[PDB]
Design a protein around this ligand. Structure first.
Ligand SMILES: [Mg+2]
Ligand SMILES: [Mg+2]
Ligand SMILES: [Mg+2]
Ligand SMILES: [Mg+2]
Lengths: 216, 50, 50, 44, 19
RNA sequence: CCGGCCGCCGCCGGGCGCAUUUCCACCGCGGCGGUGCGCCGCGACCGGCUCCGGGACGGCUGGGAAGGCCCCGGCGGGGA
RNA sequence: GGGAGCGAGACCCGUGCGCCGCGCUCUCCCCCCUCGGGGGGGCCGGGCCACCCCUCCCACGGCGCGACC
RNA sequence: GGGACGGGGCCACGCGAGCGCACGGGGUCGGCGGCGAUGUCGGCUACCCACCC
RNA sequence: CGCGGACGCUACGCCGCGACGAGUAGGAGGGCCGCUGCGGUGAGCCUUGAAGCCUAGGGCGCGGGCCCGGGUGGAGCCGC
């Protein structure tokens, strides 16, 4: 009972509150809150009645068991972590994909999934790259942004949508949501000069190019 | 003196070498001198007490 | 232990500032304040066993 | 590097490290409001 | 208040002011 | 280093008991716990240990004599 | 490295997140922002230290005066 | 005594009950993907040969 | 109300905490290392093939060395 109020002191650093336990006593008002003072299951039979047992004893032990293990404190399963970004990546930037069978195509970023991986969707008319998950580590950030806040991203697409099931054939919903996003993104990148052949061409090194020399 | 007691500071309990992770490891072998923590041992070393 | 630490944190301010104040008053007149020789040294060995 | 060991040996280091933070974050506002109270005294 | 022999009544009366 | 009556407890046989009873054997790419790979590999946060980097506050001083900036700062006296 | 537990209590037999130290709310109430869910302000008293002012006691300098040595 | 409206800090203000985060008495995933029958996956050691020291 | 609670301890054993490790002549201790033989014992193995040899076959031990599979061989052999 009683509503759950928010935590009264704020957080100053990771771990340290901004209020001590004295200004917190009077803040809590701890001046006016003084405090002073199954397994057996029966059944009928259509003899008598029988009493069954829940979770009954085993019928076969192995010749040797392994012992219990100790308890640590700070180990979480993967779905309960924190999620991070870099500094430079925003929605609407231009990336250089590296390691797929889409080696080196200049693509466009959308968002950060809940599992960590990125939602990288090239326009399929240009770079032959649809809505397709990639990973943050393997992506070089080209400092060239576009506006994004005038989109209506669907809400059913997530990691459960891209995740593997088991030849192949393309489902018609991949063709739907690819066309639906691309018909809203594409006039933004078409209206910028010299970009539909930029997203198009590939990154490649040559003699006289050192990566620690050019900024990109 | 702080960055030698807190980091490289190990005890000597029964001819052995047991580190310092609590005040009660000091308060066994120094309870007869009103030295019950680490910050009293530091006031003793910095200002050299009796 | 928290109170035996706060009292010392006050006594270390008082022991550092008062070894400045006697040389500022001794420069108002023109004399000199020699501080006392210290009572603690830290000894490191650098050479071998051979 | 760790904290909740320093608190385990010496719990006052909490209220000695909460200070030297609200000072090293109160003087920086009393410093930038100097350089502002004086850059409007520069165009004069 | 510290050593357990003497200040047992002091922690007594604190237990009969804390409730 | 023990015989029999006696009391309680347990098991074994042959009985009645015959269906919301126990394993009998699968089926279900199920719910939990435990152990792990045929092979090749990848990522995530937490800890110990370490190398470096980037910002920001504060003390002492011949109370930095410091030096130097902001009509030659203003008036005077001299000098090479 | 691998059985460290807690919690019921002879009115009950469960469960396998558990010590030491840090603080979150709840067993009282009002108000705010964001479409039930999130984020916040508060809940009321005492003493000190900051400000003006009277102000004793002590420590250490230096000047001035006076006495005995 | 205020000086006649005053901002920040004080671990001051012998069975209380339940829940949760944790820089906390030495690591876990309650996370994944491609290769596999007459040409390929593994076998450090033991056999021949080359090279750096 | 229910008939339920892992592992261990060959005590000449098992488990935990600390500092240390050079080494000739020389000294001591442990050797489930090894050869040939005797009292005991393995209801041992053996012409459906023992000793002994051979080996680009598979493995263990710090090491002394042992064990296994695959070939020849033809009558006695090993562990505690
Ligand atoms: Mg030499
Ligand atoms: Mg030796
Ligand atoms: Mg050979
Ligand atoms: Mg013959």
């Amino acid at each position: 009972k009683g509503k759950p109020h928010c935590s009264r002191n704020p957080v100053l650093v990771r771990g340290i509150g901004r209020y001590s336990r004295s200004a917190m006593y009077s803040r809590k008002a701890l001046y006016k809150r003084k405090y002073a003072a199954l397994a057996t299951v029966t059944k009928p039979v259509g003899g008598g009645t029988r009493v069954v047992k829940l979770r009954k004893m085993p019928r076969y032990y192995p010749t040797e068991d392994v012992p219990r293990k100790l308890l640590s404190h700070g180990k979480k399963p993967f779905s309960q972590h924190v999620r991070k970004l870099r500094a430079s990546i925003t929605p609407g930037t231009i990336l250089i994909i590296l390691t797929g069978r889409h080696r080196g195509k200049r693509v466009v970023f959308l968002k950060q999934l809940s599992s960590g991986l990125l939602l990288v969707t090239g326009p399929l008319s240009l770079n032959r790259v649809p809505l397709r998950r990639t990973h943050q580590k393997f992506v070089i950030a080209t400092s060239t942004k576009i506006d994004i806040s005038g989109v209506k991203i669907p809400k059913h697409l997530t990691d459960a949508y891209f995740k593997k099931k088991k030849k192949y054939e393309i489902t018609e919903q991949r063709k739907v949501d690819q066309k639906a996003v691309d018909s809203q993104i594409l006039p933004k990148i078409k209206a910028v000069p010299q970009l539909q052949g930029y997203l198009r061409s590939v990154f490649a090194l040559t003699n006289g190019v050192y990566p620690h020399k050019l900024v990109f | 003196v702080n960055e030698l007691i807190y980091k490289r500071g190990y005890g000597k309990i029964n001819k052995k070498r047991i580190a310092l992770t609590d005040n009660t490891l000091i308060a066994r072998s120094l309870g007869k001198y009103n030295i019950i923590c680490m910050e009293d041992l530091i006031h003793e070393i910095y200002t050299v007490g009796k | 232990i928290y109170e035996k630490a706060k009292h010392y944190h006050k006594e270390y301010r008082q022991m550092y500032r008062t070894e400045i104040r006697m040389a500022r008053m001794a420069r108002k007149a023109g004399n000199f304040y020699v501080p006392a020789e210290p009572k603690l040294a830290f000894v490191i060995r650098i050479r071998g066993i051979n | 590097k760790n904290l909740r060991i320093m608190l385990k040996l010496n719990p006052y280091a909490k209220t000695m490290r909460r200070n030297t933070i609200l000072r090293q974050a109160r003087n920086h506002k009393l410093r930038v409001e100097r350089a502002a109270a004086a850059l409007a005294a520069k165009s004069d | 208040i510290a050593h357990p022999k003497l200040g047992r009544r002091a922690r007594a009366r604190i237990a009969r002011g804390l409730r």
